[PDB]
Design an enzyme around this catalytic site. Sequence first.
Site, PDB file in Angstrom:
ATOM      1  N   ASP A   1      -5.765  -9.578  -1.939  1.00 51.00           N
ATOM      2  CA  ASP A   1      -4.896  -8.532  -1.409  1.00 51.00           C
ATOM      3  C   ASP A   1      -3.743  -8.264  -2.365  1.00 51.00           C
ATOM      4  OD1 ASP A   1      -3.425  -6.812   0.105  1.00 51.00           O
ATOM      5  OD2 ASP A   1      -2.819  -8.292   1.603  1.00 51.00           O
TER       6      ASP A   1
ATOM      7  N   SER B   1       1.118   8.615  -8.855  1.00 59.74           N
ATOM      8  CA  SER B   1       0.026   9.492  -9.229  1.00 59.74           C
ATOM      9  C   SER B   1       0.574  10.867  -9.584  1.00 59.74           C
ATOM     10  CB  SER B   1      -0.951   9.596  -8.061  1.00 59.74           C
ATOM     11  OG  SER B   1      -1.953  10.564  -8.287  1.00 59.74           O
TER      12      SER B   1
END
Length: 330
Positions: A35, A199
């Site tokens: 994770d 992004s």
Amino acid sequence: STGSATTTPIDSLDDAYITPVQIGTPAQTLNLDFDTGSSDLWVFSSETTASEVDGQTIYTPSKSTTAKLLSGATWSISYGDGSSSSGDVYTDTVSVGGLTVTGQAVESAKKVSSSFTEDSTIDGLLGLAFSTLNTVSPTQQKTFFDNAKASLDSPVFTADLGYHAPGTYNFGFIDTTAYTGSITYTAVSTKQGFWEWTSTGYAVGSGTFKSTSIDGIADTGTTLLYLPATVVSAYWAQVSGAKSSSSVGGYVFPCSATLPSFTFGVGSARIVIPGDYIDFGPISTGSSSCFGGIQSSAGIGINIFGDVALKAAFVVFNGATTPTLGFASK
């Protein structure tokens, strides 16, 4: 040193991925959920409340000759999905894919929330976010990667998650045969303890690319892709009959639909998520309404590039002094 381990979907939907981890001496192999959105290595154990164990493999520290109770140390964690767990702490030898750390903090669960009990395939978590998020008290502990880093050939790990198939976590090296083209690296902020990046935009299907900054985290422990409501609406508008369902808890779509791809930007590069990766199947057994793999982050507080996005890429978690993330197509 290096390590390399195969990671395997827990079910036919890729709801999560499990990677075998050797703990203790002799080794006890547990299948952990790696994770990159958390920083605790915790396991089901011989100390876990018996009614909260339902099929998981447990760590028994008393059978490990290298286990040592970390005196006074406790841990307690709550995840973004509402789940939680807590317990005490041992140090022990932990190996992943041939890479060994001695003295790793292994957080033994005394209590786990129902969602963990109900998932027999996940024996615990191995956190790969920054150690500043580790919950051990009163002395915070380091992640497996933090402990291994100095020994690795290069201070990196890579995630290569498969679509409906196994993939690979590598530590200490880049497998240049595992991706196409080049790896585009992008800046990371560690201020929240995550692999947080920006992004450069998105496209839906064959549509034009929208240049827009989308801050979010690269999180292998989250199944879906959580993005701003504007982006998510633009995606599902291209699927006839798709709608946001308050009762189901997100966007649903007719199971008869063919889903469009979704592209996200990494610098000037583009990662294309095929439409099929966005199908999470019937909302309940036998339903013709299917759950979408792109959902709104509006109720989270952060955008999350979970498995739906990451499995479309070869992803480098570069833990150099100034961390960065790399993405390549594959």
